[PDB]
Amino acid sequence: TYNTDWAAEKTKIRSFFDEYYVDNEDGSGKAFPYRDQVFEIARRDKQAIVVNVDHIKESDIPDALELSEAITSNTKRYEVLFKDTISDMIQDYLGDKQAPVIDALDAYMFQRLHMDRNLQDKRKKYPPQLLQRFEVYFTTDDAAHETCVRNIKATEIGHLVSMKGVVIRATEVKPCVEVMTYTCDTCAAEVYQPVKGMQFTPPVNCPNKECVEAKANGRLHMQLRGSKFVKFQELKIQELSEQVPVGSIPRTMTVHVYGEMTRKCNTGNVVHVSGVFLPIMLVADTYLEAHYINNLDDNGVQSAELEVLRRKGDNYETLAASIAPEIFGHVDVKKCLLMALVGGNDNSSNGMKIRGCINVLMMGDPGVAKSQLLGYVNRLAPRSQYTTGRGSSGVGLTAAVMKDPVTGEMSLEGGALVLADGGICCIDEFDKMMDHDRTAIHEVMEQQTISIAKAGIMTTLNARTAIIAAANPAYGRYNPNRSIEQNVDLPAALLSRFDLILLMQDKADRENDKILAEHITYVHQHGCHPNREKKDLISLETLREYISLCKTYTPTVDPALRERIVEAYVEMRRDARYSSDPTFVSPRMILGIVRMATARAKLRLSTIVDESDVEEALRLMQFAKDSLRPEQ
Amino acid sequence: MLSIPNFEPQDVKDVRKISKSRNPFELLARSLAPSICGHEETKKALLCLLLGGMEKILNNGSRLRGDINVLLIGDPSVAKSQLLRYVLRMAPRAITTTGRGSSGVGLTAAVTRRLEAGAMVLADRGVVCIDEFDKMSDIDRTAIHEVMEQGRVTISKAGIHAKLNARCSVLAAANPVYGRYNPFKSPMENIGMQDSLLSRFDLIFVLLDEHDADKDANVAEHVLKLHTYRTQGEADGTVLPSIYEENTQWAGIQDTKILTMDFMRKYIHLARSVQPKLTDEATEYISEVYADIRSFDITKTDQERTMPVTARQLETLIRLSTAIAKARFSKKVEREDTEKAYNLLHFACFKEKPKARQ
């Protein structure tokens, strides 16, 4: 009740590679992309083929469904047949020519095959892992193969399985043995030993018949110019939050990664994985052997919806309106968040570095959608972390020393601001954090480093992150009788590190309350924003694409803007002296002005800063200043 | 397993009949807890808590909250803990705790290295009852603010970074600041909690033990009538080791009928699964009424304000309208639902000054 006629299966597989096609976009002909990739391997511009099983399933070929089911049910065997058919295709393409020598193993094989000269002999003398030097991987997209970590059980051993999850731990790349080669002392023969699993045992005595009969007692010595190594990496992957049952905690699983799929992940990423579930060589331990990995953080091509925007221009108002369209109003606050999503340029004049990114602090009365805005920003940004004031320690924000109980070792563990490096950290309930936890971010917000000297550890870590924070005023509500410093109960050293500080009030008004009620009740009716003016708005995906495009530019400042910027700084610094209800102003302010001007130039996708951008930065700073004195 | 619903077509027929009757919401609210005299508006609120609102998940992944949260503050010996224990019996997936002996870490989630679930994580898609809520510390109270709104617990400490789902409804009971309600100070002064915490409760009830000879006589007569009762098929020396109720002397309510608790459990189980939608008359009524509630001024009527009023109370109006529409087995929310929701909220919002001050 088993099928072992491999030649017929090879015929089916080769017919798939010959006959799958996609029509050309101009209608000029047909592309046969799998055999194009085979020829790329033959000319050594490539190292792996990724095959989609659903293309086999939906191909217009006899026995296609049966081939797809057989691949899925015994994937560990069909990899060999795919490698054999691709090797035969490579030899049919190549003919009497030779593939180029690129590495020492290629040089050894090409030299030794013609030393042997000077197919039965080839296949008996050399193992197929050494004769074939490329990789084959499978993928699926149909929802029949979607599972959690929790559901992979005894029925799934040997089958192809697909899942989705979060990466907890990842090792560095290591060399892993695939084929060992030994040579005899006395008789100069060679032994080839392929390795499977996580162990191997080396042979001791020479097996060659002349050496054995002569009893020459020749030892075997291993050689690493002929031996084959491969990139190896290990991961631990956790369940996603939507997959977990009610009132339960997520589970984890170990994943082994080989070859070209290594270095595609680091800690703090969300991935889609396809692989084969296997035991370790009567109760057994198990792991997942990864076949294909995709970062959902990451995934010259442009979408047509983006092409329309890039041709249109003047996009600033639409981009401001497209941030969380369920939330009514707060246009200037959305513009401030839009600038914080992009930021300015890093400067490194004469060895002295200056921070390029922008920091924003939001405050307001209860029930004014601060948490909703922070949640939308966390979804919109590529790499971002979310924390609350109560749920975080000053060691969970920065970095921790971990004492391993198994070994006794000490190691470092990066916190939220380390994981968010190159991106955005959102801190909710910022006023309820302890002072001795809050003072950890002083180095990060200005020098963008974390430096540690504890136990037997002394290092520095990079933390190049923007911080967006939300809080309530000092007694839960703004008090118009108390000063700005009494309403905002933060020290001046911390206050100077924020480029923008905003206040959002809730005040009763008989028309605005009705308009807000109409908007919220429409959202509850239909599940989407009203759009009563029928104006265009941008999808979340293409807004993410546009912001990613904006980050590539580095616009330079015109030297003509000097007098405007400096005069604005002096005029700003006069009021803090001569006011009854002043605020703190320091030399960081003028750098904040330059940052916001360059940020709007990036949003415009221009390469030179304009005085219009300088004026818009000044307008936003004036709005932020006026927010802190309502009804005065 | 030793540690729940059951149905037959006769039971389905009776559910159809009671749903087609004249005032099913009032019948269920009266039938909820008969051996406690009074507290009719709070019983309506507890029925709305047991039914619950509708969660909305929008096209961009944004979420809007569905659960309902209720607070009771009042004088001692006014049956706050008794009503908490009754809701603990009626609701499936329910947990009870006290603020006296709960840390915020144990109430949400703990590091033990491993991550350990707390009570509000364990009660996901369920009910938490908290007694002696005024005895909790503010350091523990500030840990709840994320859970009561976003339905999440987030932790970032040494070696652990994780989200946890904690979507549940909070029912809480407390005593006022001075241990007994002071009539010469305002209700907000007597409650003594900050606006950011008070805004997260859909309904707040202040319960007072007023000396008044009529009410004292009625309450004492009800209590003694419940204490002199014995089952019809029982001998006098014994010791504990259909749709309508039949013996009702213990219940005090003289003539009006009461539903059996098993029928209550079955009816609530079926009515929970109804998924009503909103309509234009409901939308117009809600939008006008919200502006009227915010703009009303209390110096006219010698009343005083019991709650903050924010944008969350508009969502409370929407939630209560859907919860009332569920009890009718209706597929649509109408003005008939929204008027009852407004009357309940307006009862909660305002209170006349106590007789000691008048």
């Binding site: 162990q199 190594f229 002295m352 950890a440 180095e443 200005e446 000297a453 100077s496 | -």
Partner: protein, 164 residues
């Protein structure tokens, strides 16, 4: 990350903890036994470096070698430069060039760089009296104290930076 470097022969004990170096060597890989009792090996290999040369020369810092190699001509240029009456200002303002004013603080940092006379017992190799200079900066926010610390940290060969 961290890496193991193996020194053989005359390279042994040629470097201290705290030094910053460049290493040239051979990259190697070795197997490990599953049990120390038995012949079986793990199929994932351990890696290290066999050293061939250590270099510590770096021109971006004040040099690390007691100044043995300076030519007579540059010694005479130094002696000629020392006769300016401006010598304090000329040396002080060249340190931390991107920082505006704070000339008194710059002169203090110049005194920190030079130090006093060493006073040691050579029989016991112990300091009789301290010759190093300690400095505290205390002031308002946004006045470049951390930037001056960064300049002094980058200038010297043996330096450490800690915070909070």
């Amino acid at each position: 990350h961290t890496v193991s470097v193996y020194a053989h022969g005359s390279l042994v004990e040629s470097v201290q903890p705290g030094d910053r170096i460049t290493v040239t060597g051979i990259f190697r890989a070795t197997g490990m036994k599953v049990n120390p009792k038995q012949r079986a090996l793990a199929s994932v290999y351990r890696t290290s470096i066999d050293a061939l040369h250590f270099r510590k020369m770096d021109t971006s810092r004040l040099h690390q070698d007691n100044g043995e190699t300076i030519t007579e001509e540059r010694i005479q240029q130094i002696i000629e430069l020392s006769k300016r009456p401006d010598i304090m200002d000329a040396l002080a303002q060249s340190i931390a060039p991107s920082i505006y004013e704070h000339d008194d603080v710059k002169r203090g940092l110049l005194c920190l760089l030079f130090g006093g006379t060493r006073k040691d017992d050579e029989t016991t190799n112990k300091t009789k009296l301290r010759s190093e200079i300690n400095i505290l900066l205390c002031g308002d926010p946004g006045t470049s104290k951390s930037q001056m610390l960064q300049y002094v940290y980058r200038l010297l060969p043996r330096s450490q930076y800690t915070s909070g």
